[model samples]
Target: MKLAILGAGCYRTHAASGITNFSRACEVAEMVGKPEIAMTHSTITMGAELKELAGVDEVVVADPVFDNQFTVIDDFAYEDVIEAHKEDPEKIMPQIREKVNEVAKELPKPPEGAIHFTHPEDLGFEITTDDREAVADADFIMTWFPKGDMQPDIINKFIDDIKPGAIVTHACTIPTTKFYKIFEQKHGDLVTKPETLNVTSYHPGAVPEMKGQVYIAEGYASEDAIETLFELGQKARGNAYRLPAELLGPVCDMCSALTAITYAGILSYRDSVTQVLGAPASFAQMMAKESLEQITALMEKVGIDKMEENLDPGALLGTADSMNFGASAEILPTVFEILEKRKK
Candidate 1:
């Protein structure tokens, strides 16, 4: 089962955790019974390094689908920190390391037993400039495209080249239904009557904590294709979740809730204590973290609904009394007002 990876720039880039698409792809390639992996990009400059470092079998220098200045990260609205690093590695890499270390400290230690990818000249697979040849019987194809005019053009090109049963996948931002519609409309009769194509979404929702996880959003796909996706996830030394059809975006957004709310609450607490009560920001952060940690631990030990039962009578009184005093009283109605305005 050969996996044809389109957009090598997206997959073979570096990350702070040293767990980018380069590492993930190699893991999946090895896990899926040592399948041949052919990755395509618009240029050949990166081919040599990706081949040697990521253990990709072949590097296909394909034609550019978009402008040379734009990479897939741009489509996702993320800052290309790698680009910044290229300009000043001496200044950027240390900052990246410092940020990575802070994230490591904030998170609890990960469960034991984890590993990374291979390295050797003996592990050579393929390196060609032919794009069509790369996908000649590819079982899996991975790429990302935003909703744009070029999407249809790219789909037409790939479908014309790829085998009939190839499971063509896009990233999380591209809705499964939208991808299916584009491919189906492009291929029309060829896609349905003979059921010649399988389409889905692949989202590597790796958090800062070095979690090797992939989210495979299921849509109009074959049973075997779904199983193969799960197999790829497992082989990549990560977990794969088969989300309901077209629900990948919503689920991923929902995941941001924990950190989003926690940060907002922490900020409010620290600002209230420091700006209003004249406490030092350092002492305020310590207080905020201490209270946050205790609250979080209690909530984890006992469900949120049952938390009231665990709190001391004095603690409960103080918590309820805060709303009647200080800035909390004024902010209470404004919270409701903001929440109401959000709908409009």
Candidate 2:
């Protein structure tokens, strides 16, 4: 087979494979009947050695000065620069192709003077308090307007300005069905049509900053619209759950006890270790952290009952005898009542 080595340099070796470009070029010349070897002025000394040792037939001077420089892998193999990749092409070519395309399609780097985290103005967003300005040309509109009959009126004020296919969402106490009904009544033209208004709901189980579940309910929204709202929830560092429009409010209501129960349990653990058992405050705090992890692991890997079975006998018996369901248990009745009302 005829062969040639281009951009040959001397002395430098591949860092990963420990092969010299000149050495490989000479080997190729011997295998391919003294094929052409291309080099610059600085590599001419080694280029002379190729003809003497490997009997290279021709040595072409590609450049006057030593201008070629790249990573050692590129410098070591002629195929790496000219032909198919030096590595397995089937394995590496797809990755190389992806990288080449990614450079062309990737988002631009953050501009200078852009604050890493700041108000909307710093992040290329236009913020406005005026309803018309806020709704115009918006792709997705989220609202937390107070609970009242006035919400639909407020939305109607900007309904005409809202772009086609814009997703309108609520993340507050308003039920998704109620919100959708009100919106449909006010903007009947926007609804009852394809590729138009998408009304949806998001009920965050905890504050947005805290990691918690965001229950999303789709009304007139498409899959993409629902996913877009979930994407917003994800940006808030919350796990997103898609729920039926009618069930979202009840599920979110039931989740209210989670924070109260978890916080109180943690406080009780610290209080027992420090106040009752006479452990140091710092020790108790550290113990609480470790205990929470252990409990979380038990809940994940084993059922709580199975976890209780493995507890120390003395402590198990003490907890079994003195476990008190306090007045906090009253939250249960209210929870059930709300769920029942929702069912009705």
Evaluated with TM-score, which candidate comes out highest? 1
**Of the candidates shown, which would achieve the greatest lDDT relative to the real structure?**
1
User: Model 2 segments beyond 4 Å from truth?
Assistant: 1-124, 187-195, 254-344
Model 2 Cα lDDT, one tens digit per residue, 1-344: 00111122222111112221223333333344432321111223233333343344443322111222221112223333223323323343343334323432332221111111112122123333466665655565556554678667766666676667777667654778778876666454634332467888655544331123467886578899888667655543236788678767656676546645666666665666565667787986886788778867876787755654554324433342342234323343454454344331
Clashes per candidate, residues 3 or more apart or on different chains: 2, 0
lDDT for residue 223 in candidate 1, whole number 0-100: 83
Compute the lDDT of residue 170 as modeled in candidate 2: 72
Which tens-of-lDDT digit does each residue in 145-194 have in candidate 1? 43456666666765677778778777644667777777666555653332
Model 1 quality (TM-score)? 0.47
The C-alpha local distance difference test score for the whole of candidate 1 amounts to 0.50
- Compute the lDDT of residue 146 as modeled in candidate 1: 38
Instruction: Give the clash total for candidate 1.
Output: 2
Worst 10 residues of 1 by lDDT: 111-120
* TM-scores for all predictions: 0.47, 0.38
